Amino acid sequence: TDASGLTPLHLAATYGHLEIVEVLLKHGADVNAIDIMGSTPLHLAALIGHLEIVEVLLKHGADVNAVDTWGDTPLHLAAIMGHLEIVEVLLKHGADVNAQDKFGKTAFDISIDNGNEDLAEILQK
Amino acid sequence: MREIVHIQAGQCGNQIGAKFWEVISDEHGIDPTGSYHGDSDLQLERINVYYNEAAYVPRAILVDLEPGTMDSVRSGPFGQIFRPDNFVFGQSGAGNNWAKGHYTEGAELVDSVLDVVRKESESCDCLQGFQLTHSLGGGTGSGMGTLLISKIREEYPDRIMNTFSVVPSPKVSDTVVEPYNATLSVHQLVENTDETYCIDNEALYDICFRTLKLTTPTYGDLNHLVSATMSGVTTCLRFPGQLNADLRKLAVNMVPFPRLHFFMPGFAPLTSRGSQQYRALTVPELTQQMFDAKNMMAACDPRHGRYLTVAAVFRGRMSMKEVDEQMLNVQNKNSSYFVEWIPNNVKTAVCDIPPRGLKMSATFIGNSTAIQELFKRISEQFTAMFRRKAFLHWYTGEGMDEMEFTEAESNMNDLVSEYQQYQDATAD
Amino acid sequence: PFELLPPSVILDKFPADFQTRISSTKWKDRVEALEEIHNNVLKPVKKLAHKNQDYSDYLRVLANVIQKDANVQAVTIAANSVQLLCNSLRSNFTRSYGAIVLVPLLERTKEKKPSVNEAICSALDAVATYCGFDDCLEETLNYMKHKTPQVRIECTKFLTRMLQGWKSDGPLQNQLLFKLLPEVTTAVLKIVNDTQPTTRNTGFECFATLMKLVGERELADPLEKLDNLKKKKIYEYYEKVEV
Ligand SMILES: Nc1nc2c(ncn2[C@@H]2O[C@H](COP(=O)(O)OP(=O)(O)O)[C@@H](O)[C@H]2O)c(=O)[nH]1
Numbered sequence: 099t100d101a102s103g104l105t106p107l108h109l110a111a112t113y114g115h116l117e118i119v120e121v122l123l124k125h126g127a128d129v130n131a132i133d134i135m136g137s138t139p140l141h142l143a144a145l146i147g148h149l150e151i152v153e154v155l156l157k158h159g160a161d162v163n164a165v166d167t168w169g170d171t172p173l174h175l176a177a178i179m180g181h182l183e184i185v186e187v188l189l190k191h192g193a194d195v196n197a198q199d200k201f202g203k204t205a206f207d208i209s210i211d212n213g214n215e216d217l218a219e220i221l222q223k
Numbered sequence: 224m225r226e227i228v229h230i231q232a233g234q235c236g237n238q239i240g241a242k243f244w245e246v247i248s249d250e251h252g253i254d255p256t257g258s259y260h261g262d263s264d265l266q267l268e269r270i271n272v273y274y275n276e277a278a279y280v281p282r283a284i285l286v287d288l289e290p291g292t293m294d295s296v297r298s299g300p301f302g303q304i305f306r307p308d309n310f311v312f313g314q315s316g317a318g319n320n321w322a323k324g325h326y327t328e329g330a331e332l333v334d335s336v337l338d339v340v341r342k343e344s345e346s347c348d349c350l351q352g353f354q355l356t357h358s359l360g361g362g363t364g365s366g367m368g369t370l371l372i373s374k375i376r377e378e379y380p381d382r383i384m385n386t387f388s389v390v391p392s393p394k395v396s397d398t399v400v401e402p403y404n405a406t407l408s409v410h411q412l413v414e415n416t417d418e419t420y421c422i423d424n425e426a427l428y429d430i431c432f433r434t435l436k437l438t439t440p441t442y443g444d445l446n447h448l449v450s451a452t453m454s455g456v457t458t459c460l461r462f463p464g465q466l467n468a469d470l471r472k473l474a475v476n477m478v479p480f481p482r483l484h485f486f487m488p489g490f491a492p493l494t495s496r497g498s499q500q501y502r503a504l505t506v507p508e509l510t511q512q513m514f515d516a517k518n519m520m521a522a523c524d525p526r527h528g529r530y531l532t533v534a535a536v537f538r539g540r541m542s543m544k545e546v547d548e549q550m551l552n553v554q555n556k557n558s559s560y561f562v563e564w565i566p567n568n569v570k571t572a573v574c575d576i577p578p579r580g581l582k583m584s585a586t587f588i589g590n591s592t593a594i595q596e597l598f599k600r601i602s603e604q605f606t607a608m609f610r611r612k613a614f615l616h617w618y619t620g621e622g623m624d625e626m627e628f629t630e631a632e633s634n635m636n637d638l639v640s641e642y643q644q645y646q647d648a649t650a651d
Numbered sequence: 652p653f654e655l656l657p658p659s660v661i662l663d664k665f666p667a668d669f670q671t672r673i674s675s676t677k678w679k680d681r682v683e684a685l686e687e688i689h690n691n692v693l694k695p696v697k698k699l700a701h702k703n704q705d706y707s708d709y710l711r712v713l714a715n716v717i718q719k720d721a722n723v724q725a726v727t728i729a730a731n732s733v734q735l736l737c738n739s740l741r742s743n744f745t746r747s748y749g750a751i752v753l754v755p756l757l758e759r760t761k762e763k764k765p766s767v768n769e770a771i772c773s774a775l776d777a778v779a780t781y782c783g784f785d786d787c788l789e790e791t792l793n794y795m796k797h798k799t800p801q802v803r804i805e806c807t808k809f810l811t812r813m814l815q816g817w818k819s820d821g822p823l824q825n826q827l828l829f830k831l832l833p834e835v836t837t838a839v840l841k842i843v844n845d846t847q848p849t850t851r852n853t854g855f856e857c858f859a860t861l862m863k864l865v866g867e868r869e870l871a872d873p874l875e876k877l878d879n880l881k882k883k884k885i886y887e888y889y890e891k892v893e894v
Pocket residue numbers: 232233234235236238239287317319320358359360361362363364365389390391392395396401424427442445446449
């Protein structure tokens with residue numbers, strides 16, 4: 099970690115470095131490592147939309163319902179940006195849908211606050 | 224108020240710009256050679272606006288940092304008609320970075336563009352204004368475009384600045400820094416352009432998918448709707464009409480407040496690429512399909528906001544009296560969705576010449592407060608990435624301070640709040 | 652004054668890889684070359700050498716990038732160095748040093764980014780505090796009649812700044828008085844009657860800041876040619892303006 103708490107896994111999962119992720123995880127890098135803001139490598143992977151990274155993170159036991167300082171879970175971030183394939187994979191690994199951020203808007207309240215007709219279909223199917 | 228200088232910047236700018244010049248050159252009876260082969264004289268009545276005299280050449284400037292689209296346009300069907308000297312294309316690209324186009328490598332090329340801009344302006348009897356096509360989610364059209372706007376603004380402070388800005392969406396391009404670029408670009412258009420047509424790609428995609436029933440829409444499927452919409456909103460400018468003749472008269476009728484100059488265009492009927500839709504829709508149909516959300520080029524529900532000003536343009540031989548009855552009806556039957564404190568805010572024009580392929584068409588231009596939904600959508604994606612400062616090193620590495628992101632985010636939310644402010648104002 | 656400080660010498664510190672780098676087709680080279688001499692040579696000093704040092708060679712390479720460089724980033728860091736020079740070199744910009752940067756700063760007031768307009772104005776203020784109205788007065792009036800609306804409002808605001816801190820030497824008949832109505836009040840009226848509102852708003856202040864210095868009855872003659880409306884916006888600032 100540095101002055102922010104970011105690990106090589108955070109930054110590899112953020113900027114789509116799959117080969118760097120698979121290697122760090124083979125040699126035992128903490129998947130649930132949080133930075134100073136509570137962001138896990140799964141948070142940043144769901145944010146940028148690296149599907150292959152999101153699955154590899156989960157396959158090593160990634161906390162799928164972790165919360166950062168702002169109260170967002172990887173399901174919130176995969177939804178706000180519209181990475182629908184990642185939205186599915188999270189739910190298929192037990193992503194809780196009722197998580198409320200500091201503002202109180204859940205995953206379904208974000209599919210509504212932006213009128214995402216695509217997301218509303220998957221979010222309850 | 225006569226001649227209009229057209230500019231296309233970036234990948235998307237030169238794409239929809241070349242497709243727009245194909246459309247109007249045909250409507251004005253101009254073949255790729257530049258010669259006139261039309262029949263009616265109304266085509267040549269106001270050809271001086273977009274074209275120059277030859278021995279007809281478009282008054283268009285083509286800009287991009289990447290020379291890729293330079294050759295894709297010249298290899299196009301109408302690529303031989305543009306002036307060779309009007310191609311201003313740099314060496315390196317923009318990498319879909321607003322800061323590279325606006326601050327770094329676009330500023331190194333912008334002086335070359337203003338030299339071509341000046342050239343086309345000196346040969347104008349009376350320059351009416353400028354017209355820009357670009358994408359807000361890109362790097363060159365977003366970054367270098369807003370720089371070109373602010374540069375033209377300081378050199379031509381008396382001319383209208385009009386833009387055709389397309390909005391990024393996850394349903395099309397998968398680049399994640401597009402909310403950054405669009406937020407930084409909207410932060411410029413709100414303070415530099417006199418009028419801006421919002422062309423949402425999420426709306427264009429939903430139209431090709433849910434209305435034209437195309438499973439996998441391509442950019443040609445999307446740019447077909449853009450060229451049709453651009454041809455309609457420019458009809459009154461190139462054909463001898465009475466209402467909204469020049470750029471300023473249109474802006475004086477459509478922009479009640481300076482920052483609220485973001486228009487929600489519509490068009491009917493929604494045709495496909497080379498399909499069969501012969502039967503010219505009736506006037507009551509053209510009016511119903513004009514005022515719906517399924518024909519808006521912007522992902523906003525007009526039911527969620529109020530229309531400040533409205534400009535409707537009908538094309539084709541039809542009963543002008545039957546048009547007034549319909550345009551009156553939709554107003555007094557949906558009076559809650561029209562601002563009371565602006566009397567006669569809806570204005571309808573008629574043009575005898577239809578677009579090539581149809582007998583009756585109708586183009587909608589609305590200054591609705593529902594356009595805040597579009598900015599709310601972009602502002603949500605912007606903050607989601609910005610809270611984690613993802614990819615910020617792109618823009619800081621090109622000189623931008625982190626504060627510039629906070630300001631552009633703040634001014635966009637101010638623009639949203641203002642659109643809500645007049646959505647709640649009453650008459651009493 | 653606390654200006655008994657030892658004058659340090661900084662014209663030696665300039666590395667050989669500078670005049671080549673500051674004249675490069677790569678923006679990074681020009682930005683880094685200006686920034687290093689700003690942060691490492693000009694920043695950690697407070698009193699420069701007034702004698703046996705000709706900074707005019709360095710000042711004109713700053714004006715070249717201020718006026719002509721397209722990289723707005725370098726324009727900012729270069730104008731800051733000008734402000735630092737004339738600050739740390741009190742009573743140095745007699746004529747050549749003051750004029751080598753004045754008109755490039757006025758021309759570059761076109762830039763609208765607040766950080767850049769802040770840097771160029773603060774340097775224009777710093778060159779004015781040591782050259783009150785040498786070239787400034789005569790040269791500032793020229794750029795209030797410039798074609799660009801942005802350089803009109805900024806050069807007009809800049810006169811108000813110098814006009815505010817106008818203490819002169821006295822007793823009377825200074826360069827301002829003999830140009831009061833022949834040129835100065837005429838250039839201000841063009842701003843007062845500009846087509847744009849924010850521009851006129853600058854001239855309203857600038858006119859009211861002028862009536863603050865010279866008796867308000869002395870300028871009642873050009874006041875009557877003005878609209879009764881423009882008279883109330885001018886009297887508006889007269890209550891707020893002082894010095
Ligand atoms: N409708 C439409 N949108 C486009 C087209 N090309 C690019 N875009 C959009 O523009 C954005 C990328 O900007 P682009 O023009 O490629 O980068 P630029 O060259 O720096 O302006 C993406 O979000 C795309 O959705 C096009 O042909 N049609």
